[PDB]
Every structure is written in structure tokens, then in C-alpha cells.
Amino acid sequence: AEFMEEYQKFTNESLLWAPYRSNCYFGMRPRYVHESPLIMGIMWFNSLSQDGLHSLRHFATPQDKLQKYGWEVYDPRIGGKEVFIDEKNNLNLTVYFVKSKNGENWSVRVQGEPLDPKRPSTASVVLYFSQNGGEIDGKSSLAMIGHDGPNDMKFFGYSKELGEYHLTVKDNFGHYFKNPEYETMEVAPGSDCSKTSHLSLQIPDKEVWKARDVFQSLVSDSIRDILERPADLIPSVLTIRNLYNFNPGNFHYIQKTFDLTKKDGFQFDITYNKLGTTQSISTREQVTELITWSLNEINARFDKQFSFGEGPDSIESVEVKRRFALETLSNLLGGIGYFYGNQLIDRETEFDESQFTEIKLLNAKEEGPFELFTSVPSRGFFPRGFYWDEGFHLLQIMEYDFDLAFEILASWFEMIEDDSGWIAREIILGNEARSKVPQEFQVQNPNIANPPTLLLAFSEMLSRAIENIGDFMTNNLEANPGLLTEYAKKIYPKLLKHYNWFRKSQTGLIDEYEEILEDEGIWDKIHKNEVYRWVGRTFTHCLPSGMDDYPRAQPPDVAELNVDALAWVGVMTRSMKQIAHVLKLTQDEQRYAQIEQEVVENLDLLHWSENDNCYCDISIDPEDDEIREFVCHEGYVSVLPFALKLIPKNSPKLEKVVALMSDPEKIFSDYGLLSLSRQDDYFGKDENYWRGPIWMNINYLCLDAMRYYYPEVILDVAGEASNAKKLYQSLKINLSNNIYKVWEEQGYCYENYSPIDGHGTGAEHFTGWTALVVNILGRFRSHHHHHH
Ligand SMILES: *[C@@H]1O[C@H](CO)[C@@H](O[C@@H]2O[C@H](CO)[C@@H](O)[C@H](O)[C@H]2NC(C)=O)[C@H](O)[C@H]1NC(C)=O
Ligand SMILES: *[C@@H]1O[C@H](CO)[C@@H](O[C@@H]2O[C@H](CO)[C@@H](O)[C@H](O)[C@H]2NC(C)=O)[C@H](O)[C@H]1NC(C)=O
């Protein structure tokens, strides 16, 4: 326990400070600080135009249509470099983040330059800071204590949680906008674009996220005052000022308007030093060497974890492939955020498992606070925790930073409350998070489950730890049985609660079929307790399966048994077996081992269709009742038993699944595996999400499964390619080539890809499970054997 607290202390300190407000282009708050956090964000716009406030950047949104934004290099333990290309605002913005070795001090360098040096424009950068908590704790504060000329400012702050600190904003260079042939640029007292403007005021903690709206509102009131006039005084008109004579408070705006016709651009530093620190960040030169050191250290960590060769993809060079992989991983890590607040949950409205109409949640309530440290599918579209997405994020994160993956996993399972094992599918905390979500999707339903991909990720992590440790650094939990055992003892009761909850809530009705299964002569050899159905499906959708519009049995029936629901129970059971092994719980381990084998046997006995050579959902013939029908829509659901490694090794069924995945007339394409066979009735129909398009998450599992079932495919030996090798190689090549190409051309990683011509579709900046392309390119010997 003492060793664990020593490890957890260091982990905490290394992850305390980072740009964890991932919904912002650049926003910061300290990890796990909910009462008195220092909150920071950066906004910018072109103040030279009359309607520059309409192009004010703050939150990441696809509606901004930036040419490019994201981390080129990033690791939240260290820092990184983020770039924003904004053609509308003529701005080429780079933001560096670095930290002291103990992680308690930090600096942000904002560096801008024009995209076109002869386009008349300005870069009006607005920093805001808020020391929260004062209204609650009666002590937390942040005050400007002085300045060195107009453009360098010194602040003193107190956070009850993090202690006293100094915050400084200082210019290194940059030409402030001004017409030299005027006596002054001022148009009103405080409205002067020729120097830094600062405004302090009191904003309630819960309203701090509205920094852009408050800014626009205050500037609008100043404009109203002014006009109740040359074009080059507009920047001064759009400079914030203390019009209403607010008393100083927790919140601070700092506005700097630079002339973008000067080619060299600008640079200023924002530095935070804990009071009494032995590692103060003190000079511009010190920041410059920290940035150089930090970027090198991240490149070194990346090179230790991944390795890249020439081929088999067609990416022009190994240097370019590696850089692509680094940027993609950096954006996945850069989506990691810290969230705190209430969910909207409806527990009162009655749930009827035998009805299939959409449900009206009319008894919604504020519940919480909750908190969560998690990666996100997309900073623009989906800047929040998604339960089923996170398992896939962790499969990528774990390959780079094993211990970080354990931090995120633990955070998720902290959300399990005492009376229930339920975890919401989508985690929306507070008004800031709700602002990105249509009201119709905000209210969560505690009767609805989702695929437990977190436990698939946990299974893969425990597999590596168990392999490496034998008998019972960013990978201490992989190598140290003492540390792993303490982590496991803490989390076990939570996983168990979740496991029991999932199994009960999704229990199928085996008692129908009995007469039918007796007639087939297999009723006696199936395991009646291991059959499952997705509870809460509707006529046209099945949200609990994670693949909403993947075709299901019609009409819906309470006797349906879903092959993918059973497969997921298999995966959960496997993870329980592994954590039981780690805890030396022999009798529990052997129970889970047998349950896993019973899942395996039910998949082959019940869900395998000899006629269709496929795993299928099953249902009772609505006409006949004496007949049970195999609902067979060939696609991701059909391959899931393969992709989750539940089919017995050497099973004759393996070859048929491989044949399914290799067939160009079904789900094989030049751009990866299609979610649904081209020959299916539903292919291309309706919203067309899981009815054709290629998704990286399932594609990656299939590749991983190939290596498990056909271990020879990992060797590239000259000779005759087996069917398994042909598939493995071409799929890996097709995914790598296409995801890169779309990223190179269309700009970024996408939620899914077109079966037509492989073009990117769905949400943009999807890192996101599409970041699993990093592993496909660079993963090497994640398994641990022996090097005698
Ligand atoms: C590691 O950091 C976290 C900070 O969240 C600590 O684990 C919160 O700690 C408080 C007080 O111990 C508890 O009330 C909460 O229940 C904890 N939450 C979670 C999610 O664990 C932990 O104490 C820190 N350890 C060290 C050594 O700093
Ligand atoms: C964004 O601005 C940066 C900074 O100037 C540019 O990346 C300099 O570019 C040259 C040419 O590649 C290199 O010699 C330097 O190493 C770069 N410096 C840094 C810090 O990257 C980049 O070209 C600009 N991008 C756009 C689209 O204008």
C-alpha cells in the first residue's frame, strides 16, 4: 500500500498540469481539481474587420472550417506543440506547452505569424484566466500585482487545493497594431489596440466556460457607447475595456492585438510558478530550452514504444509515416480531458423490456457531481467520454503509455455507484458539456447498456502484465506485481458490480426454443444461463449493441438472442478470469474460465448456422413457432466471435470467417472491411452508418485476431501466401494506405470511410478509434515472451 501511494503520488504529479479542456482549441485546468481550479483558455480573431467577433475562435468546432488544427507532438506528462492554421483570420498560430521536471510549474508560449504578410489584418489574441472556488472556500483568489510596462503583467493567486502561485504574461516580441500618423489609436478610455488590454471581474465558477459570450457581450456594450471613424480604428473599437467599472475579481481577460502585415509575427509567454518552488521557470531562454528538451523527450518516448519500416504500405518515406503516426497519437492524447459536473439521468420513468417503441424520459433529474479523466472520440464533435469508444482508445494509448491507460480505466470505474453497476454510455458533465449536445440526447437511461470495450482493453493490458510478471518507466504496473495487485484489489469490486449488472440486465429467454432444441437433440448440451439479448432495442435501432442501425431481427421479439451480446459477455468473463488470476483467487478464476468456455460452446452450438456458414442472431419464426430462424446479416456482428478471439483455435469455422472477410462481393474492399455485406438487403439503406461504411475499431480487432489464430502471418517470408496471410497483408495495407491518403488530402482522421472510394465520412478529427492506425503502422512485440 505504501509503495502504491508512492507510485500514485508521482503519477498524480506528472499528470497534474496539461491542456485538459480538450473541447477548447487551447484550454487548461489541473487534473482532478474540482473545487478551486485555475482555468485558462485562448481565443483569437481578426479585429481589423467590422464583424471580426463572428470569427472569434474558442471551442473546437467543425463549423469554423480551419485549414488545420491539432498537436504535432504531445504527451500530457511532458507538454507539446499545437498548431492552428486559420485562413479566414490570416493567422498561423503555434502554441507550445512545457512543464518543470516535477510537473508543478508550467509555461505556455503563444507564437503567431501571418499566412499572407500583405493582407491587411490583425491577430487579436484574448487570454482568459479564472481562479475558481473563492465563493465556496472563502480564500481562493487571483489578482494582478504589477507590470513591467504596458505589455508584461504579474499576477498572484491562491488555490485552496494547489496552493499559492505566480502567474506572468510577458511579450518576447511582436508589433502591436497602430497607425503611426495618429496621435493615438484610442477611441474611448481603455479602447486602445496599441497596447495590451486587461480586464478583471467577478464571474460565478459555473459560468466561466461562457468566456467567449461574456467577451462579445462586453465589447458590444462598448461599441454601443462609442457610436451613441476610419477603418483602421476598428481594432481599438473591438478592444475590451472596463466600461461598467467592475471591481476586480476571479476572472481576467488579457487582449493583445498584433499587426499581421509584419512578417516575423509575435510571441508571448504565459508562465505559472508554484510559490516556493525549487524548479521555477524564470526566463525566456529557459522556456526555449524546455521546449527543445520536451519535444525531444516525446520523440524519444515515441521511438522507444513504436518502430517503423519501409512498406508494406505506399507512404512515400519511413520518416513521413513515423511523423504521421506521431501526430495521430499526439491528437489522441491531446483529446484527453478532465471533466466535472452533473449528468441528466431518468431513473423514475418505468422501463418495459418487452416493448420496442422509443422511450420518452419525462422524469429527468440532475445527478452528481461526477468527474472523469478520459480521452474523447473527437474534440470538435464529441469532446466527452463515450463508454464504448474508450476501450478502443485505450488499446492505442496502452501501447504508448501503459500507466496512463490504467489511470483512465480507473476513472471510468469510479463512476459506478453503490446501488448499481450501470455506467452511462455517454458522459455529459455540466452546462459546458451540454452546450455541445442536442437537448434530445442529453438525458441518460440507466436501463440501457453498451458493449464493455473497456474490459476488452483491460483484458489486453492484464495479458501483457501477466505475461511479463510471471508468478504472483511509464509501465510500472506492467512490470511490478506489487503495484498491479493493489490496483487490482481496488478495482475488482467495481468490475464485479459492472459484470453482474451487465449479465443480469441482458439475460435472454432460453426457455422458448426448448422444444426446438430438444428436437435438434442439443438442449441437454447447451448452457442455459449463458444466453443474451440486447435489452432496449427499438423497431429501427439497437443502441445497446453500439452499432445502432446494423440490421437486426424483424419484427423485434423478446425471444431474440444476440450473438454479439453473448460474445461481449465472453470478453468480460475473460477479463474477470485474468484479474482473479492476478489476485490469486483460484476458485473464482476457475469459475470464470468455465463460464468463458460455456460462452464459447453456446456460440458454436446456438449461434452458428451450418447452412449460412456464419454466426447469427437467433429468433423464433414469427409464423411457424416450431422453427427457430437464423437472422444472418453478414457483417461486423458475424465476425465479432472471430474478432474477440472466442472461436476455438483450429476450429473449422475459422476458414469460413476468413473467407467471409476476404470476399470482395461481401465485406472486403480496397479500403478495409465493410460493416455490412454488399449483398445484404440493408446495404446502403437509410442513414447508412453501420450498413456499409468502414470503421477502424472493428477492422483493428479483426487484424489482431488474425495474428492470434494464424501466428505465421506476422512473418514476411518469401514464398506462397496462405489465405490468412493474403487477407492479413492486404487489409493492413489497405487501411494504412487509405487512412493516410484521406488524412493527407482531406486533412484529418474520420469516424468512418466510404465503401465507394474510401473517402472520409462522419465526424472529422476523429482520434478517436481511427488513431488505432498508429498500432497498425508501428506496434512491435506488445507480447512478452523471452529473450535468452
Ligand atoms: C492520487 O490522486 C487522486 C486525486 O484525485 C487521489 O485519489 C481522490 O482523493 C480523495 C482524498 O484522498 C478522495 O476523497 C477521492 O475518493 C479520490 N478519488 C479518486 C478517484 O481516487 C489519491 O489520493 C492521490 N494519491 C496521492 C498519493 O497523491
Ligand atoms: C506554420 O508556421 C510554421 C512556423 O514558421 C511553419 O513551420 C518553419 O517552416 C520552415 C519550412 O518548413 C522550417 O524550416 C522551420 O523548421 C519551421 N519552423 C517550425 C517551428 O516549424 C509552417 O510552414 C507554417 N505553415 C503554414 C501552413 O503556413
| Residue 113 assigned to a binding site | yes
Q: How far apart are CA 370 and CA 422, in angstroms?
A: 14
Q: Do domains 1-310 and 311-788 have the same CATH topology?
A: no
**Ligand 2 atom closest to the CA of 85, numbered from 1:** 27
Q: How far apart are CA 679 and CA 430, in angstroms?
A: 45
Q: Indicate whether residue 747 lines ligand 2 (CB < 6 A).
A: no
Does the annotation mark 13 as catalytic?
no
Domain ranges of the chain: 1-310, 311-788
**Pairing outcome for strands 337-345 and 365-374:** antiparallel
- Axis crossing angle, helix 481-505 with helix 402-413, rounded to the nearest 10: 40
Q: Indicate whether residue 92 lines ligand 2 (CB < 6 A).
A: yes
Q: Indicate whether residue 85 lines ligand 2 (CB < 6 A).
A: yes
3 state SS of 125: strand
1-310 is classed CATH 1.10.1840.10:
no
**Ligand 2 atom closest to the CA of 111, numbered from 1:** 4
Do 598 and 586 form a contact (C-beta atoms < 8 A)?
no
Do 203 and 249 form a contact (C-beta atoms < 8 A)?
yes
Does the annotation mark 520 as catalytic?
no
3 state SS of 764: coil
Q: Taking Cα atoms as reference points, which of 583, 566, 567 lies closest to residue 493?
A: 583
| Residue 500 assigned to a binding site | no
Which method resolved this structure? X-ray
Query: What single-letter amino acid sits at 403?
Result: D
| Resolution value (Å, 1 decimal) | 2.0
Q: Taking Cα atoms as reference points, which of 139, 198, 134, 143 lies closest to residue 166?
A: 143
3 state SS of 576: helix
3 state SS of 216: helix
What's the N-to-C CA distance of the chain in angstroms?
A: 34
Distances (CA, A) of 569 to 315, 414, 450: 39, 21, 11
**Ligand 2 atom closest to the CA of 83, numbered from 1:** 1
411 CA → ligand 1 middle, Å: 11
Probe residue for ligand 1, chosen from 3, 10, 12, 494 as the CB with the greatest number of ligand atoms within 8 Å = 12
**What are the b/e assignments for 15-44, b being 16+ CB within 10 Å?**
bbbbbbbbbbbbbbbbbbbbebbbbbbbbb
Q: Whose CA is nearest to atom 8 of ligand 1?
A: 32
Do 362 and 346 form a contact (C-beta atoms < 8 A)?
yes
Q: How far apart are CA 190 and CA 52, in angstroms?
A: 19
* Backbone gaps in the chain, preceding residues (C–N over 2.5 A): 228, 472
Which one-letter DSSP state was computed for residue 411? H
Q: Indicate whether residue 414 lines ligand 1 (CB < 6 A).
A: yes
Which one-letter DSSP state was computed for residue 356? -
CATH of domain 311-788: 1.50.10.10
Do 460 and 402 form a contact (C-beta atoms < 8 A)?
no
In total, the chain counts a number of residues equal to 788
194 CA → ligand 2 middle, Å: 27
Catalytic member of 72, 297, 548, 557: 548
Place of cell 529557459: 286
